[PDB]
């Protein structure tokens with residue numbers, strides 16, 4: 110009775126800043142000591158629809174599993190607010206990276222932009238349009254060199270109530286927000302990465318250039334840049350959306366494939382054999398065992414644990430869409446053998462393995478499912494991790510979870526620990 114949803118699992122550490130829809134704070138899990146980012150949205154001030162509609166949309170966002178899209182874990186609430194808890198990212202906005210470097214080589218801008226293309230492509234396939242894509246709405250996961258980027262600030266426009274001029278498409282000036290407007294804003298970003306200037310440079314004047322749609326590669330720094338880059342930018346800053354290319358086309362452009370070739374090497378063999386061994390054990394264990402492992406890999410893990418497996422996941426992602434498909438696993442298995450020196454069926458193993466790892470039936474293995482099968486089970490079996498998992502299921506809080514109270518797909522905690530092992 111005297112226990113609250115959020116305040117019982119989480120402790121507020123500090124305030125990270127003001128998201129447009131609500132305050133954003135850093136919070137800590139009281140058991141696992143794992144830190145998180147939570148947006149606190151005031152129900153009375155911010156709501157436009159029913160609480161049911163909101164939670165339905167947030168459920169859809171919570172199942173967006175893409176390396177370049179912000180991760181959301183759960184949606185709680187009390188009498189005054191919604192609490193949306195998500196993965197914490199500490200590298201800051203991409204806008205600041207641009208102030209420091211002030212422009213990027215074609216090699217550096219391609220690694221960055223390839224990730225934006227991957228995330229936007231994923232968002233559109235799940236029928237989400239950012240409508241406000243810019244560097245300020247892209248965060249870096251950490252301070253390391255080649256860390257992945259993360260797209261934020263999208264999804265709640267319909268549900269809640271709450272520099273932009275450079276990045277908006279002309280049709281947005283005329284009351285149209287279709288999927289193409291994002292491809293326009295991405296083009297402006299890529300224009301700024303290579304040159305350091307907005308293609309369209311008072312705000313009435315900036316918007317005036319946007320309305321005409323006139324941009325030029327006249328700045329002295331474009332002479333050195335390649336023709337394929339200019340081909341991509343032209344197809345993205347096409348005035349008419351019906352002729353403008355798609356996010357998928359942006360990702361597949363030859364320019365991207367030139368600088369997007371992260372491929373396995375002999376240095377990665379230690380982490381590939383480990384990943385392979387855990388994957389076999391995963392396929393051997395019964396369905397009940399497997400699902401419990403996915404549940405904990407997808408809800409109770411952090412980046413630092415999966416940091417080694419992130420690079421392996423990124424190298425196996427030839428097309429850079431963010432997912433590993435049936436063919437990509439066959440080729441990664443054949444190349445894993447080649448680096449060792451072993452002659453290589455592999456195809457039969459993977460086809461038998463695809464249903465077992467693609468627990469959602471999505472047609473490909475997303476990152477969370479890859480971690481659940483490629484990580485040492487010992488890491489997931491930590492006592493605090495199992496404490497949190499057990500407490501999630503016991504809605505009553507009696508101390509024993511009923512048989513139906515198990516939705517991992519009377520038992521004491523100590524009986525629960527043995528069951529996982």
Ligand SMILES: CCOc1ccc2cc(-c3nn(C4CCOCC4)c(N)c3C(N)=O)cnc2c1
Nearest residue numbers: 125126127128133146148193194195196197198
């Ligand atoms: C359905 C909506 O759900 C969510 C869930 C998680 C979110 C996290 C952030 C976030 N903002 N910031 C700062 C804040 C000050 O400005 C710079 C960036 C972080 N360092 C964040 C993080 N996740 O680490 C923002 N919006 C979120 C919305």
Ligand SMILES: [Ca+2]
Nearest residue numbers: 428430432433
């Ligand atoms: Ca892929």
Ligand SMILES: [Ca+2]
Nearest residue numbers: 467471473475
């Ligand atoms: Ca999947």
